[PDB]
Amino acid sequence: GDTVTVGFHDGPNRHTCTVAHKVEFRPVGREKYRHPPEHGVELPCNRYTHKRA
């Protein structure tokens, strides 16, 4: 996409903010994607972990 937005409700407000900022989907290996499929070859990638601390 092109613009990142975030919003959360409290009941009177939608509390949304927006930043125009480029976002990209980088494919690993040699074949472009739209999203990685269910099956195929494995490759070493890098990404943000999901641990609390």
Binding site: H35, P36, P37, E38
Partner: protein, 53 residues
């Protein structure tokens, strides 16, 4: 008709399998997508899921 719906429901039942919904990393759901079909010029598509409707 209702009779055809009965012949559909006479012995069929839902079932659970895996789908690669990566928001949750290869989850097993009752709603398992199988062989979506689209070839109509008008842009319609029909999908054959894994649950009885």
């Amino acid at each position: 008709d209702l009779d055809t719906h009965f012949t559909q429901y006479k012995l069929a039942r839902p079932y659970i399998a895996d789908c690669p919904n990566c928001g949750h990393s290869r989850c097993d759901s009752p709603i398992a997508i199988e062989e979506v079909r689209g070839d109509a010029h008008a842009g319609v598509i029909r999908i054959q899921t894994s649950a009885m409707f």
